[PDB]
Design a binder for this molecule. Sequence first.
Ligand SMILES: O=C(O)C(=O)CCCP(=O)(O)O
Length: 428
Amino acid sequence: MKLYNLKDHNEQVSFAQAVTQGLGKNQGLFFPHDLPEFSLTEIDEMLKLDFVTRSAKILSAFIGDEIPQEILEERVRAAFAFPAPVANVESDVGCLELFHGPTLAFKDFGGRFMAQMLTHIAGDKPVTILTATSGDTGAAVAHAFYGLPNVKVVILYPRGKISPLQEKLFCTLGGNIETVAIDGDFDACQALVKQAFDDEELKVALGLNSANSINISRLLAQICYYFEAVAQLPQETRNQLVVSVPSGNFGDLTAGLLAKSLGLPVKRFIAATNVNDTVPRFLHDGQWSPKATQATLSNAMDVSQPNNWPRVEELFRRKIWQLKELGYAAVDDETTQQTMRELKELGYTSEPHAAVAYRALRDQLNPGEYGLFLGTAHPAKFKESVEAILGETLDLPKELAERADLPLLSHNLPADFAALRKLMMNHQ
Ligand SMILES: O=C(O)C(=O)CCCP(=O)(O)O
């Protein structure tokens, strides 16, 4: 496979280099040099294969000769140790549940997949994985790389800006895990991570790399659950599919488009965000003006500067698609709560993030079309809110319960790269 820096089309790297390097020069994201296209027949055939084998093929389509599809099947079978079932919410709406993994969030798929690739590509090479999180990614990465003798992870997250349970899920591990509560929002956290890649001294010293969607391995793996979703739907709807994706940093939606660019039939995509509507407002007047981040019920989506947006623009550009074809909507918390109330009424328990997607989908799903909204995380990860918003008690899954009472081990640091750099050089 070949990749290029969105900031420098001449700076190119293979899949192996992209996976171990993470970021390109000048903090630029890597983009697939070639956009493979399966045929209608192949697509039709892939959908009949089991989840694991299908995912392997999709991935091989990009990776190419670098890694034999056979080996790729083994690594994927190890990573995707859980399903991605579609739950019928309404007669014309389905919810792609992506929280059946070890951390109850879709970050599990790409998180574990990357772990597999890195260990396969780099083996036991000493590596420091610096990742920024707004709630879920941190947990998926912390668990995916826990115990790996050659690996040491450092997660940055906005202090007090994520849910209690989300924090407990990855800030009470210790050992191989190191967590940092930054005095700022997610954006500042991601900026600090990216900034670390301009520090040649630091990169080489710690063998820097990132598990955020920044890493091509993260992006690609997420393309797989879209196919799995369609494969569960009846042929009848296969040509009238509308997918709503609760977006924050937009890595999920990006993977959705890539799936379509591969040949997966998707009538229309909807980018559902919360009050942090930098994208929605952009798609409306073409003016890019991010507002200061605002903490909401869907904290994992409190992103004002989606780092993956450039990857979406490049895909539309190269695929020759018109952005006006992209559905979008900004949902506030009041609407979120009431939307959660509705879903419960319909007989489906959901949470803030998924509610935002459903709201946009429900308000844009035309007759004759089947709608899908991604359940990006288990509602229990936001027990407090869900209980008070739904007015009903909620039991805690084993994955959360076994760490709800454990002590936090997070360090506190201001939004200063100098402070972070020192702490990292103190916890080698
Ligand atoms: O951190 C989280 O839980 C996010 O959903 C957003 C940004 C991280 P990503 O780049 O891995 O998607």
